[PDB]
Design an enzyme around this catalytic site. Structure first.
Site, mmCIF file in Angstrom:
data_model
loop_
_atom_site.group_PDB
_atom_site.id
_atom_site.type_symbol
_atom_site.label_atom_id
_atom_site.label_comp_id
_atom_site.label_asym_id
_atom_site.label_seq_id
_atom_site.Cartn_x
_atom_site.Cartn_y
_atom_site.Cartn_z
ATOM 1 N N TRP A 52 0.778 -1.251 0.000
ATOM 2 C CA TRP A 52 0.000 0.000 0.000
ATOM 3 C C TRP A 52 0.821 1.321 0.000
ATOM 4 O O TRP A 52 1.790 1.483 0.737
ATOM 5 C CB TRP A 52 -0.957 0.003 1.170
ATOM 6 C CG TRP A 52 -2.095 -0.880 0.897
ATOM 7 C CD1 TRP A 52 -2.184 -2.199 1.191
ATOM 8 C CD2 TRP A 52 -3.290 -0.536 0.202
ATOM 9 N NE1 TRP A 52 -3.364 -2.713 0.715
ATOM 10 C CE2 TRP A 52 -4.075 -1.710 0.119
ATOM 11 C CE3 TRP A 52 -3.780 0.637 -0.354
ATOM 12 C CZ2 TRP A 52 -5.314 -1.730 -0.484
ATOM 13 C CZ3 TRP A 52 -5.023 0.608 -0.975
ATOM 14 C CH2 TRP A 52 -5.768 -0.557 -1.035
ATOM 15 N N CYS A 53 0.406 2.227 -0.876
ATOM 16 C CA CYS A 53 0.895 3.617 -0.912
ATOM 17 C C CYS A 53 2.333 3.680 -1.324
ATOM 18 O O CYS A 53 3.093 4.541 -0.868
ATOM 19 C CB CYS A 53 0.706 4.308 0.443
ATOM 20 S SG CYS A 53 -0.976 4.275 0.957
ATOM 21 N N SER B 62 5.080 -7.031 1.712
ATOM 22 C CA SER B 62 4.274 -6.741 2.850
ATOM 23 C C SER B 62 2.815 -7.049 2.589
ATOM 24 O O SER B 62 2.496 -8.193 2.177
ATOM 25 C CB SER B 62 4.484 -5.261 3.330
ATOM 26 O OG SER B 62 3.858 -5.104 4.611
ATOM 27 N N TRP C 174 10.336 0.336 10.102
ATOM 28 C CA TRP C 174 10.867 -0.242 8.868
ATOM 29 C C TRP C 174 12.343 -0.089 8.681
ATOM 30 O O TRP C 174 13.033 -1.043 8.213
ATOM 31 C CB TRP C 174 10.099 0.295 7.672
ATOM 32 C CG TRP C 174 8.653 -0.050 7.675
ATOM 33 C CD1 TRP C 174 8.052 -1.032 8.381
ATOM 34 C CD2 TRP C 174 7.619 0.593 6.927
ATOM 35 N NE1 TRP C 174 6.708 -1.034 8.141
ATOM 36 C CE2 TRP C 174 6.419 -0.048 7.240
ATOM 37 C CE3 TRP C 174 7.604 1.639 6.006
ATOM 38 C CZ2 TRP C 174 5.200 0.309 6.657
ATOM 39 C CZ3 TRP C 174 6.381 2.025 5.449
ATOM 40 C CH2 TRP C 174 5.206 1.360 5.769
ATOM 41 N N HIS D 198 12.646 -3.471 6.529
ATOM 42 C CA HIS D 198 11.380 -4.017 6.075
ATOM 43 C C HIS D 198 11.347 -4.251 4.523
ATOM 44 O O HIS D 198 10.439 -4.886 4.054
ATOM 45 C CB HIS D 198 10.275 -3.067 6.496
ATOM 46 C CG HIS D 198 8.905 -3.404 6.006
ATOM 47 N ND1 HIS D 198 8.298 -4.631 6.218
ATOM 48 C CD2 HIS D 198 7.977 -2.629 5.398
ATOM 49 C CE1 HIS D 198 7.074 -4.604 5.720
ATOM 50 N NE2 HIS D 198 6.846 -3.395 5.243
HETATM 51 C C1 LIG Z 1 4.421 -0.235 1.528
HETATM 52 C C2 LIG Z 1 3.643 -0.516 2.759
HETATM 53 N N1 LIG Z 1 2.510 0.195 3.026
HETATM 54 C C3 LIG Z 1 1.791 -0.051 4.183
HETATM 55 C C4 LIG Z 1 0.677 0.698 4.469
HETATM 56 C C5 LIG Z 1 -0.032 0.468 5.644
HETATM 57 C C6 LIG Z 1 0.381 -0.558 6.534
HETATM 58 C C7 LIG Z 1 1.525 -1.315 6.248
HETATM 59 C C8 LIG Z 1 2.247 -1.060 5.126
HETATM 60 C C9 LIG Z 1 3.365 -1.810 4.839
HETATM 61 O O1 LIG Z 1 3.726 -2.708 5.618
HETATM 62 C C10 LIG Z 1 4.068 -1.583 3.665
HETATM 63 O O2 LIG Z 1 5.232 -2.266 3.420
#
Ligand SMILES: Cc1[nH]c2ccccc2c(=O)c1O
Ligand SMILES: [K+]
Ligand SMILES: [K+]
Length: 274
Positions: A35-36, A100, A159, A250
């Site tokens: 995510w993101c 992730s 991370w 991470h």
């Molecule tokens: C790139 C990314 N985005 C997230 C957004 C919300 C919660 C966890 C993560 C995560 O663990 C991860 O690696």
């Protein structure tokens, strides 16, 4: 590495994606972002795999070099998007590799696509247990329009884990700089919902209709109690394996891309031998 970036209409949305269009023998390696963030997280891994494999990286709705607000969607919809891109590209057999919480997409994709099309999977650094308090807190912060940024900062701390890791810092601070609350708040709702409805990545995997080889490769959490739930899950499930990569962050795809690559190749070769 931006020699491979494309864009296409996918149902309602234009989605960008990486595709090196390598003409070679399957399976295609499908790298799935969390995510993101976007395909940039994979730029070092793509280099490791470019010569020998077709490599596809879809970006989720609202994700890419130019993020945008989009209507609400979850991992269900990420799965449909990914398959639609594979269909448009004519890709038949593929090895999905997730980062992730891109794992929720990977495991639902395995269910949906079935073992003939998606015979194995590689999940990278994905929290196997139900949310501990610090992470549960992080999610609640991400969901908060007042405190989402504070949420992301706390996550960046976890991370990086005390390392001055120049590539990872660049990814968090520059490559995710354009993502806003619409994304981060959503990631919080979806991830929280995912664990609520599925229990855990392990519970969701164990519940596959057709279980098949999955390997968890990860550098964190670094504590022995986390290693232990991985070894216990692997003792119970012949199809499950794991590898502690010992990388600083991470983001093993960024910081130990050569190690992540060798596990991907191993699974890609096992697939080639049937
Ligand atoms: C790139 C990314 N985005 C997230 C957004 C919300 C919660 C966890 C993560 C995560 O663990 C991860 O690696
Ligand atoms: K350093
Ligand atoms: K096992």
């Amino acid at each position: 590495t931006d020699t491979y970036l494309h864009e296409t209409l996918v149902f309602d949305n234009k989605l960008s994606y990486i595709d090196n269009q390598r003409d070679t023998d399957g399976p295609a390696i499908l790298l799935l972002p969390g995510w993101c963030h976007d395909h940039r997280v994979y730029k070092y891994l793509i280099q490791e795999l470019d010569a020998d494999f077709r490599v596809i990286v879809p970006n989720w709705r609202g994700h890419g070099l130019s993020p945008s607000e989009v209507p609400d969607f979850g991992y269900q919809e990420q799965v449909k998007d990914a398959l639609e891109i594979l269909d448009q590209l004519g890709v038949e057999t593929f090895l999905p590799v997730s980062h992730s919480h891109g794992g929720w997409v990977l495991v639902e994709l395995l269910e949906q696509a079935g073992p003939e099309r998606a015979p194995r999977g590689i999940i990278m650094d994905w929290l196997m247990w139900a949310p501990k308090p610090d992470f549960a807190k992080s999610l609640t912060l991400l969901k908060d329009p007042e405190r989402w940024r504070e949420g992301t900062h706390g996550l960046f701390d976890v991370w990086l884990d005390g390392h001055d890791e120049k590539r990872v810092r660049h990814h968090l601070l520059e490559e995710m700089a354009d993502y806003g609350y619409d994304c981060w708040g959503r990631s919080g709702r979806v991830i929280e919902d995912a664990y609520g409805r599925n229990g855990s990545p392990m519970q969701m995997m164990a519940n596959l209709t057709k279980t098949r080889p999955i390997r968890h490769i990860f550098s964190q959490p670094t504590e022995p109690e986390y290693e232990k739930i991985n070894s216990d899950f692997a003792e119970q499930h012949p199809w499950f394996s794991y590898a502690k990569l010992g990388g600083p962050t991470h983001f093993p795809a960024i910081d130990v891309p050569d190690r992540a690559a060798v596990h991907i190749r191993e699974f890609a070769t096992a697939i080639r031998q049937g």
